[PDB]
Design a protein around this ligand. Structure first.
Ligand SMILES: O=S(=O)(N1CCc2cc(O)ccc2C1)C(F)(F)F
Lengths: 10, 229
């Protein structure tokens, strides 16, 4: 769902 | 604290993303390809920007995500308006993608958005928006979304942050020396423009969500994800 956003924040 | 906060925001500024016009004349498709391709790349850099705002990465993951999902178009637009501030009748998307207002006629529904963006940019020009005021307002945009409780101390941490940014803006405005009453008026004038940015943002989002329906543009990656909602 925020598959890629989670990825760049973390 | 205000001086340091302002310096941090100054140092957080994302790079200018470079893109060029296509070789061939614009079509509705190729104009939307250019602007979304630009937007997708700016989103990547928006995340790194946000993470440099003090406190941001101390918020809970959900809060981070939820503020970015809520404000990203507003932040793209606000950075566009700052770039364009000194160039009436033009939108400076990138150094090599400078669209005249009339070029929005190329894509159904986009002229109105350009007009909203251009009028808000002219109001900022008329107010003589200073670089350090733009830094604080852009950070206020990130931090000032409705949240309503989600069901998942982050929210108190968010309030403190937004507070500090709002203090920093008040502190920037106090440098001008103008009358106490005029400092209140300027603050109001700046903040009242937040509504205009949100309003344009809403029209931009809807445009993009609809274009994406019509497959008038294929959208990718981060941009697609953000839109998927
Ligand atoms: O609302 S938009 O999606 N938007 C306008 C604001 C904006 C700002 C950027 O920095 C990069 C791309 C876009 C494209 C369109 F194209 F107008 F519908």
């Amino acid at each position: 769902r925020h598959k890629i956003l989670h990825r760049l924040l973390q | 604290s205000p001086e340091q906060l302002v310096l941090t925001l100054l140092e957080a500024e994302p790079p200018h993303v470079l893109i060029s016009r296509p070789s061939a004349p614009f079509t509705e498709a190729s104009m939307m390809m250019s602007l979304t391709k630009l937007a997708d790349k700016e989103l990547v850099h928006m995340i790194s920007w946000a993470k440099k705002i003090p406190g941001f990465v101390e918020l809970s993951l959900f809060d981070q995500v939820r503020l970015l999902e809520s404000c990203w178009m507003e932040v793209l637009m606000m950075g566009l308006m700052w770039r364009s501030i000194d160039h009436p009748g033009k939108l400076i998307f990138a150094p090599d993608l400078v669209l005249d207002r009339d070029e929005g006629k190329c894509v159904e529904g986009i002229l109105e958005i350009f007009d909203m963006l251009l009028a808000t940019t002219s109001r900022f020009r008329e107010l003589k928006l200073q670089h350090k005021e733009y830094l604080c307002v852009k950070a206020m945009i990130l931090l000032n979304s409705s949240m309503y409780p989600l069901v998942t101390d982050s929210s108190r941490k968010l309030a403190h942050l937004l507070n500090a940014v709002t203090d920093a803006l008040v502190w920037v405005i106090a440098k001008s020396g103008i009358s106490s009453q005029q400092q209140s008026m300027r603050l109001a004038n700046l903040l009242m423009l937040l509504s205009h940015v949100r309003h344009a943002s809403n029209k931009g989002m809807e445009h993009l969500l609809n274009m994406k329906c019509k497959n008038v543009v294929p959208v990718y990656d981060l941009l697609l994800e953000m839109l998927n909602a």
